[PDB]
Paper text:
In the 3′ to 5′ pathway, the [name] body is processively hydrolyzed by the 10-component cytoplasmic exosome complex (exo-10; exo-9 plus Rrp44/Dis3), followed by the removal of the cap structure of the remaining short RNA fragment by the Scavenger Decapping enzyme [name] (Dcs1p in yeast). The apo [name] decapping enzyme assembles into an 80-kDa symmetric homodimer that contains dimeric N- and C-terminal domains that are linked by a flexible hinge region. The enzyme possesses two bipartite active sites that are located at the interface between the N- and C-terminal domains. Upon substrate binding to the C-terminal part of one of the active sites, the N-terminal domain flips over to enclose the [name] substrate in a well-defined pocket.
To obtain insights into the mechanism that prevents [name] from forming a productive active site around [name] substrates longer than two nucleotides, we determined the crystal structure of [name] in complex with a capped dinucleotide (note: [name] contains the H268N inactivating mutation). The complex crystallized in space group P212121, with two dimers per asymmetric unit. The final model was refined to 2.9-Å resolution with good geometry. In this structure, [name] is in the asymmetric conformation, with the N-terminal lid domain flipped over such that the substrate is tightly embeded in the closed active site. The methylated guanine cap structure is tightly embedded in the active site and stabilized by stacking interaction with Trp-161. Importantly, the structure also displays clear density for the [name] body of the capped dinucleotide. This reveals the path of the [name] inside the closed active site and shows that the RNA body has no sequence specific interaction within the binding site. The second nucleotide points away from the cap structure, toward a narrow opening between the N- and C-terminal domains and fully occupies this region of the active site. However, with a diameter of ∼7 Å, the channel is too small to accommodate a putative third nucleotide. This is confirmed by modeling of a capped trinucleotide into the closed active site, which shows that the van der Waals radii of a third nucleotide and residues of the exit channel significantly overlap.
Residue numbers in the entry:
A (entry chain A): 7 to 55, 62 to 182, 185 to 346
B (entry chain B): 6 to 59, 66 to 154, 160 to 195, 201 to 344
Amino acid sequence: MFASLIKRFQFVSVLDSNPQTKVMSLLGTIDNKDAIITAEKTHFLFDETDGRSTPVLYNCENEYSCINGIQELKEITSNDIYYWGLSVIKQDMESNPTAKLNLIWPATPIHIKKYEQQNFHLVRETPEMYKRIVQPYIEEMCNNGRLKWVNNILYEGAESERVVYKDFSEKDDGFLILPDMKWDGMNLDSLYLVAIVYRTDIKTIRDLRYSDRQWLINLNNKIRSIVPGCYNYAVHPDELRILVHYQPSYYHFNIHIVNIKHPGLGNSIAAGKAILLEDIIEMLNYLGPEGYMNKTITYAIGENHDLWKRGLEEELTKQLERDGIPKIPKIV
Amino acid sequence: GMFASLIKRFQFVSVLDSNPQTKVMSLLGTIDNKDAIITAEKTHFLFDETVRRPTPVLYNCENEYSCINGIQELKEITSNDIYYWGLSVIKQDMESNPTAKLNLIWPATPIHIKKYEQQNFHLVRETPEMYKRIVQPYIEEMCKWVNNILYEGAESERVVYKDFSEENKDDGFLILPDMNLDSLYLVAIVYRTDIKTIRDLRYSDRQWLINLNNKIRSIVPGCYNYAVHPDELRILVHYQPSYYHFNIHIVNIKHPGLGNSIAAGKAILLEDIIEMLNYLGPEGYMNKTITYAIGENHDLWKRGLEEELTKQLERDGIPKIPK
């Protein structure tokens, strides 16, 4: 299915290019419907290898590990103790693929606006701004469409072959953990999982009250007690960065689980987007009974985000004015 | 030739660094029993050297090796609703689409070996009691070059902004670069000397911090002719900080280079420090339990954070490998 759709993709324009991270997003069409492809070069590989078994960390004995797959070298130049050149390395679908590809199709305007390159703004969202600007947006943006994949995973067996943990009695307390769409699933250094809760009344951290703290504590404990054993303790419980996003892309409470060794894709682990789950728990001690409903939350938003023109832009200008920040002359 | 000959003789010793963000790998080894460093980096995808309309949205994908044109083989990972994702093999070629950059340092010096070593990190949960027992005595032992910059003119040629009036001898600061405007990275070092980390910020410091937030955003854009806006600066502090003298990092919100340096678990937004002081009571961050990523090379790791992390995991009922 995947292959068939990639083969029909017709290029329209380049949405974004990041040579630091080797990520690319493409706009196109499939059967005259908009489509988005995101590509990422793979990382280098390392050897995969009482009666306990310990993981061999960072070894280079196997055929495709490290630089064993070099077929061809070419020097660019050299001087003193330095040599600079280029290499071609043997690619192979099973053992050394060249790049990961994601496809969104049919892609919606929200998807295209998200992936187009755009300016970002550090916004300060007060409680009243949330009530006025964001909450009405959330209720609209709770389409059974923009969340169809979440329900697909929860109730229709989607990616069930990949699920790593599932805690469900028929109720609202259970959850499952599975590989994140971002993870290529081969390099443990980039391990990225998402925990999806079954309860539906928490759309964002704004909905977490003081009474939710013990439930959140339990999720933090379960994740760290389970995830390392799924990977033969190749990643330890203290090596998992467990976090939520505000604003999230999808308005259903989901928890991100990332190898501490991962310096991070985009904003997924960045201050201004990511908040540690441990921090969510601790902050509920100090906010009121209504919890994050009472917090003024400062975060990074893109100019293409629907909320920008829906009021965050106008409110950011007024916030800058109130803070005594100059209004930038038109002369520059 | 020579280069190829040296790479073939390289005998792997250990991995210095593996970075899945940048797709970089550094290997320590030997050649003729001398230390050598090899660095490999995946190449970026390629685009046409022409454009399809008078920034990356105008790139094109017409040439043989551009974009994903070289895909020979596809394999699905999974799919869900409108989302499909998988892996691909793409035609490689030395002249038009090489696979990776490959550099050699040989003989590499110990200075060379350092710099390339990336330490491993561990999430610790540092309570108020832990700071007083483990962290605070370490900071006191820490008695430096920072004072050379502040009071002896070091890097004065490089300073971007410096407070001078007696009025803010204490509440003032200076800003200088960290050693393309998208990659703007400045550090504000404050003139007060009693704040070594965020632990020392009290409620009474909230207004002082707000003013710093306002000064930074009012000054930096003008130093760059308003090419970056005040709301395009990611202004943050670190815990643990890189030096135990309070300082604020000022980063282009779009800086593409950065990884761990801006990550939750290390970086905290300045606005968040300000907001949290409304709730932490008079002593501020002294009362906070701070969960953050600590490095294995840090003195605090073997000084008590390791031992405390293992006990925390026991108390929380988390399985771990012992000893």
